[PDB]
Amino acid sequence: NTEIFKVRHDTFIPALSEYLRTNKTVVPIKNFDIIKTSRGKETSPLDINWYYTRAASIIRKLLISKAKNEKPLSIVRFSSEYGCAKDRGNRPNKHVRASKGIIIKILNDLQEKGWVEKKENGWTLKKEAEEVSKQLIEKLIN
Amino acid sequence: MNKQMIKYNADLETTFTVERKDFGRTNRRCRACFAYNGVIRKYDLMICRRCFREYAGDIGFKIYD
Amino acid sequence: VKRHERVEDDIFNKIVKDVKNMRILTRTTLSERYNLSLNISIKLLRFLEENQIIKLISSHRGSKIYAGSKYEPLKV
Amino acid sequence: KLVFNNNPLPIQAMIRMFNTNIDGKKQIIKALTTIRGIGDRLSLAILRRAKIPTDKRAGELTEDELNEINEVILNPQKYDIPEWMLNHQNDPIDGTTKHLIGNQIEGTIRLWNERGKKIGLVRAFRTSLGLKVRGQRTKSNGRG
Amino acid sequence: INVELRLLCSNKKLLSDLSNRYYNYLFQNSPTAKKPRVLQPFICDVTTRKSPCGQGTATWSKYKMIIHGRMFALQMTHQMLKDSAAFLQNTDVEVRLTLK
Amino acid sequence: TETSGDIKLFGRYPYTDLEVKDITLEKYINVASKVILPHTSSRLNTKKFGRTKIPVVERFVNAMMRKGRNNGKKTLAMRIVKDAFFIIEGVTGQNPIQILVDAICNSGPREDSARIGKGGVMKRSSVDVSPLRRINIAIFLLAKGVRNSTFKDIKMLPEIIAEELINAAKNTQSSFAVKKKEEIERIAKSNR
Amino acid sequence: FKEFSYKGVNLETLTSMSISEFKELLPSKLRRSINRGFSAAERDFIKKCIKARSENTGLERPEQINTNTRNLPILPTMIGLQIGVYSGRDFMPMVIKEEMLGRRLRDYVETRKLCTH
RNA sequence: GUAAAUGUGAUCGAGAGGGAAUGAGCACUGUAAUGUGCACAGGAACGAGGAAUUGCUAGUAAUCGUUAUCUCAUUAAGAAG
Ligand SMILES: [K+]
Ligand SMILES: [Mg+2]
Ligand SMILES: [Mg+2]
Ligand SMILES: [Mg+2]
Ligand SMILES: [Zn+2]
């Protein structure tokens, strides 16, 4: 069954984030404490653990993609998902992508842990990454 | 024509050749009237907006709506 | 005079005595009756709602509303 | 009797860092934007290497906390702030990169413009007369 | 066995007549005959100012050329394909074939 | 989630036993139509008295989408009024709905000033307002009072809504809307 | 008092460097012009400068060198020379002093007279 | 380069609204930067506009983005959708 849809996103993304950090499965980019997520953003994130909320939300994008049986997700797709409206002085605001470097690092970390497999046209889940999510949800709803 | 230019490296002794890219008005003259302005380049027409409207009905364009 | 960034002991004492018999109370009341800033009206109000001295009745987006000891709702 | 136990410390009115005055009631982020050369972005960078909680007010900081920040301003490159975060990159006179603070900014811009004028650099001549130098059109806007 | 015949044309009345003519031919041979499939028309368009100079109220016109099309998918033996292809000439309609 | 009973406003408020309490207004104030959320798309505006059949709190949220920048932000208006009803229900102790009804009743001016002179110069005179125009002006004044009050003041907007509506229902001088109703009626009388 | 310096390098060293080395000092847009190679015109200008600095001796000045190579960045090989830069109307003369390094020849000549109503 | 307003939670607290002139840089297009992108500093007027004046009746006005539409090597604060 499509088990992921049974719980609310603003409870799931915070929940997994702790399981990640307590096992260090993803490691921060150099200068994560001062870098911005996009050229469209005004200031760096207010939470020091923003890198882990990215990791938690990336696995959610992949779980729902797997649930709906879509084509595999690309680095471009993820960059447009996290995009925003950039401020340009005296000109209309304009839609701009997220920066790729963060996303590339997360996907390469998850590859080394065996959580994400690279296909010829995108990235895909693996059995361990599915089962972690399954066993979390089964407690979390109860 | 794709014209070519010589250029020298920092030594001012070795030479290499580079190609000039075809861009701008210079080769996109109106096929009916040689004009350089208001040329419609879509659908591989190369005809100016003045010439288009007199020939449009011969080509087969119509104003439906 | 400008607003303040502490709730000193004697302001704290009298606020407890004043919050009973008040009906709906909100961030502004603490900041427009007494001299507290918005950033210290939030913190004190949140504290009293953990102590069961007040009770929260709405929290939709940032708009947040509370009730004291002489509140009473409608009845069917 | 119960006690609050969540109150800020007894606070000072204003304090001195950089031949500049900082309002003690102001929260450390927007407060360090008083010193010339500390913008918003770089203010957050320093505080997370000195390791001070962003939510304290400027008058609560000890001498120790003010020394921690003073040290990081005199030498950002020691505490792993990279050169692409700093005011003055690949200095024509020194080769090095450095971060200019307070009155150093105006002094450096002046000595630079003055040198160009001494040798007739057209860019420096325009800024002295109040004219524009980044290609902007001067017919319709920017009058008086 | 199978053939797919694309009749492509920038005139509607012609394509309607020629398809009715070919449909009649199909039903007169009776190989379990059927209608053509009406395809999404290709539409190429241009938008331009009417005046040859800047004077007056700027008035604009949209010209569009419509390429209609109809497909027959059909069952025939190779002789009947070779012989019937004599039908597919002297038309303002352009005619194209696919086979497997 | 919260309930499996009958339809109540915001799922909270009784929606029954409601009186207008001015026979001049009766037919023009819809407190019949049971709706869970003050939102409808019912296309009545293209009709002769169809804007009088729209429900009361609906007309009241529409009044908030103003000052230019807030055009179209109808969700925001619902968020605002929801909170105001909590403040009012608490403060007053009665169905917020009867506060809103009485605010309208008091805040509409009964006599007005107009140019009458046709065959010459246009000379101003008093005139008498219809039921429908009377309520249209009531909403307008209640809204205008709220907007301008909040502009550069530290108080929260849902709180200002509760301040004005109570006072208006109670016919007190304290209401911006009530004062301006007195002014119009006094000038009307001056030109009588 | 200290020797003239550009981005860390002394005039003695700087006057001895190849154009390829000097390129590691210059601003980004000037670097891109040297990476994309010199025109046939620019090469003649530079060879004349190298000839001139070599040929000149004593106290007599070398003759002026004229050029329509407006976008060329100034190089340590034309220090001390008198060079005429085309203004769209005339060869405007200037002497290439040390402080001009890191700029193009167009930066020191006006193609449009200053306006006073 | 495949929406944005928007939805929930935090935060900030009455020039933390606003981004104009300007500095030393880091890249891209191009035969050629003077054009464009990016990072850091800097922080001007403006606190709702005198006499006047322009459209708009319903999926309209106003708000919000987007153009495998046109210009187009690179350039939209322009039109046309
Ligand atoms: K202007
Ligand atoms: Mg902004
Ligand atoms: Mg700002
Ligand atoms: Mg134009
Ligand atoms: Zn022509």
UniProtKB/TrEMBL annotation, chain A:
Mind telling me what this protein is named?
40S Ribosomal protein S19
Where does this protein come from, organism-wise?
A: Spraguea lophii (strain 42_110) (Microsporidian parasite)
Single Gene Ontology MF annotation? RNA binding
Q: Which GO terms describe its biological process?
A: ribosomal small subunit assembly; translation
Q: Does the keyword Ribosomal protein apply?
A: yes
A GO cellular component term found in this entry reads: cytosolic small ribosomal subunit
The answer to whether keyword Ribonucleoprotein applies is yes
Matching InterPro entries: Ribosomal_eS19, WH-like_DNA-bd_sf, WH_DNA-bd_sf
Keywords, ordered alphabetically: Ribonucleoprotein, Ribosomal protein
In which family does this protein belong, per the annotation?
Belongs to the eukaryotic ribosomal protein eS19 family.
Q: Name one Pfam family in it.
A: Ribosomal_S19e
Q: Which SMART domains match?
A: Ribosomal_S19e
UniProtKB/TrEMBL annotation, chain C:
Record keywords: Ribonucleoprotein, Ribosomal protein
- One cellular-component annotation, GO: ribonucleoprotein complex
Q: Which domain of life is it from?
A: Eukaryota
Any transmembrane segments, and where?
none
Q: Which family does it belong to?
A: Belongs to the eukaryotic ribosomal protein eS25 family.
Name under which the protein is recorded:
40S ribosomal protein S25
Relative to the complete UniProt sequence, the shown stretch is 35 to 110 of 128
TrEMBL record, chain D:
Q: Name one GO biological process term.
A: translation
Keyword Lipoprotein applies: no
Q: Which PROSITE patterns match?
A: RIBOSOMAL_S13_2 (PS50159)
Q: Name one GO cellular component term.
A: small ribosomal subunit
User: Example GO molecular function term?
Assistant: RNA binding
Can you tell which superkingdom this protein's organism belongs to? Eukaryota
Sorted alphabetically, which keywords does the UniProt record give?
Answer: Ribonucleoprotein, Ribosomal protein
Ribonucleoprotein among the record's keywords? yes
Q: Give the family from UniProt.
A: Belongs to the universal ribosomal protein uS13 family.
Q: Which HAMAP family match?
A: Ribosomal_uS13 (MF_01315)
Give the protein's recorded name. 40S ribosomal protein S18
Q: Which organism is it from?
A: Spraguea lophii (strain 42_110) (Microsporidian parasite)
Automatic annotation (TrEMBL), chain E:
- Keyword Membrane listed? The answer is no
Small ribosomal subunit protein uS10 domain sequence ranges: 5-91
Any one GO cellular component localisation term in the record? ribonucleoprotein complex
Q: Which UniProt keywords apply?
A: Ribonucleoprotein, Ribosomal protein
> Any stretches that span the bilayer, and where are they?
none
Where does the source fall among the domains of life? Answer: Eukaryota
Designated name of the protein: 40S ribosomal protein S20
Q: Report the source organism.
A: Spraguea lophii (strain 42_110)
> Which taxonomic lineage does the organism of this UniProt entry have?
Eukaryota, Fungi, Fungi incertae sedis, Microsporidia, Spragueidae
Describe which stretch of the whole protein the shown chain covers, with first residue, last residue and complete length. 19 to 118 of 119
